[PDB]
Amino acid sequence: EYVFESPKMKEILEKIKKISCAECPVLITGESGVGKEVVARLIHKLSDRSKEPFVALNVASIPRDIFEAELFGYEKGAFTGAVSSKEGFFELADGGTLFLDEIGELSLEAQAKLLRVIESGKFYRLGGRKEIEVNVRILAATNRNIKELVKEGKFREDLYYRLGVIEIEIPPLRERKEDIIPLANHFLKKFSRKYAKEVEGFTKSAQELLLSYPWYGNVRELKNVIERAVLFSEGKFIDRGELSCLV
Amino acid sequence: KSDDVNGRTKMYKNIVDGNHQMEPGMPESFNVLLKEIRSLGINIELED
């Protein structure tokens, strides 16, 4: 289901295999449509938490004034509305993996509210007088250069090293020329099978076109273009004319 | 004459047609016995 034909992809896969028993949190950096989610889920599957629940959450999807309630939960009587004791998302993923998607967009204030939880695993709920110990492996994904955001002052340096035990960089697809042809073939096969299309490959001119365009959405843009071509396809073979949206 | 369900019908038809010949099959009670023995968790089956 996942193609890794570029040598860099093979190196990344080997490094992932080496860190299957590693439990430290990992931070992934890349561009849009490079495969951060796929690589993170592959790391999760190859680790000891293969059968453990994988809770993927986006930090920006939580309101500011209930961020702590959504992060740690609350006890009864904490506020006007604390009807009953409720657990947080960290307690939801006990023993599994927590996936912080798009960690770059997180505000400075929120980054100072989770400095003790990641390193030690201990936090008190809102209204709870007992200490909570949790064990969750943290994988964070970002499309931003955090190592530059810490210098620019837009990111908190304290959290960078808490999420900087292991750092993974995914090169853009425009440098991964060993992947363009296999990914295009796989996408064309899948979209022909789903759409009941009688197309079974590209033409040589189409293959040359696919290896020359400066893709910006990378794998996601390639998938979108392949789907657009399959929908408007009119022959057993796809020519350069169908892929006129490239150049 | 007792419990060959298809054989009864074939025999009746042949007698009405004037052909005194039968085509015997398997009695139904033996199939009932096989199902009842299988319901006890024992694997009994007809071979070949």
Partner: protein, 354 residues
């Protein structure tokens, strides 16, 4: 089938055979027999007078109640033969398939088979070389038994009472392993080897000479060699899945007034299903073991009553103090299949007079 002539010709065929084979059935074999799992103790709706879903008469499991019609009624004639309705799940075929389709029940905990424990000599006790008293005590949650010897002075088949198990637990901690119920017996049967026991018993018979002990060794070696030659496995003598008889072989008796009454087999099946469902609910809530042990004992007794009522201890009776007839009662005796329906039968084209 597409051509109706061949379709009709192929449903009146006779099976060809020249031998009959009998053996033990694994849980996989029982699951391959069945067409679905029974989950509810209800039989008939009594409001729409149609079988309940996942019940003892479910049409999704056992077949249509009418020829070539599904339960809801979307597909109704011969042109829709061999079609599974996506709304009710009932196939469109003959209603006689309710004579030859079985179901299965998933048991929450393992249960022993009463025939391989009470038919003298006991097969479990002969294979494990244990007295019947100890096996009965363990199976009915009256004593413990060691599974793994560990590094302590506890043997691999030592019976431990409540206080003995408590003091052993507080002394050794987690070095040993002691269990009760059918799980312990299944663990013992699964962890044993046959070839080593065979060679050891053969050498023991070669060296030691006796009269009674030689007979015991011969019996044990014969049992071990028979088990090895046959494709069976010892742990198959403990039930995990339970077969369910086709519904047309256990019909409901209708009476003038709309009362459907009940049958003994259906009642025993309902009791087993109720106990299994209650135990399934209790195990999920992590309830205290002081109750789940009683629940497991009652499930074991219910399964025993279904398989062979009255063989072990008390017999479950009906309202009029009559014991309920089980499957064994249907098979054996002067009223069973062999004497009453197979060695002799009633016939057509016959009469009598003075």
């Amino acid at each position: 089938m597409k051509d109706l002539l061949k379709f009709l010709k192929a449903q009146t065929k006779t099976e060809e055979f020249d031998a009959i084979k009998i053996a033990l059935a694994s849980p996989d074999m029982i699951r391959s027999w069945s067409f679905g799992e029974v989950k509810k103790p209800e039989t008939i709706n009594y409001r729409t007078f149609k079988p309940e879903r996942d019940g003892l008469f479910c049409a999704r499991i056992f077949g249509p109640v009418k020829d070539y019609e599904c339960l809801c009624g979307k597909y109704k004639r011969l042109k829709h033969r061999g079609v599974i309705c996506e709304k009710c799940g009932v196939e469109v075929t003959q209603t006689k398939v309710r004579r030859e389709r079985m179901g299965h029940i998933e048991l929450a905990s393992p249960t022993a088979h009463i025939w391989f424990l009470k038919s003298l000599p006991s097969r479990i006790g002969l294979l494990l070389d244990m007295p019947l008293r100890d096996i009965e005590r363990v199976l009915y949650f009256e004593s413990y038994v060691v599974i793994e010897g560990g590094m302590t002075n506890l043997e691999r088949q030592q019976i431990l009472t409540e206080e003995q198990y408590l003091d052993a637990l507080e002394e050794f901690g987690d070095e040993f392993d002691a269990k009760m119920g059918a799980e312990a017996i299944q663990a013992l049967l699964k962890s044993m080897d046959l070839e080593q026991e065979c060679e050891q018993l053969r050498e023991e018979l070669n060296e030691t000479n006796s009269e009674t002990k030689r007979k015991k060794l011969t019996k044990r070696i014969k049992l071990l060699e028979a088990f090895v030659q046959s494709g069976n496995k010892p742990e198959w003598m403990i039930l995990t899945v339970l077969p369910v008889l086709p519904p047309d072989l256990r019909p409901l008796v209708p009476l003038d007034g709309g009362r459907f009454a009940t049958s003994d087999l259906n009642d025993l099946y309902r009791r087993v299903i109720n106990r299994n469902n209650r135990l399934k609910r209790l195990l999920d809530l992590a309830a205290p073991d002081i109750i789940v042990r009683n629940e497991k004992r009652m499930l074991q007794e219910a399964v025993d009553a279904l398989l062979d009522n009255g063989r072990r201890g008390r017999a479950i009776t009906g309202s009029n103090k009559r014991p309920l007839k089980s499957l064994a009662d249907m098979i054996k005796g002067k009223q069973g299949r062999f004497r009453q329906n197979l060695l002799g039968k009633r016939v057509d084209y016959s009469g009598r007079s003075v």
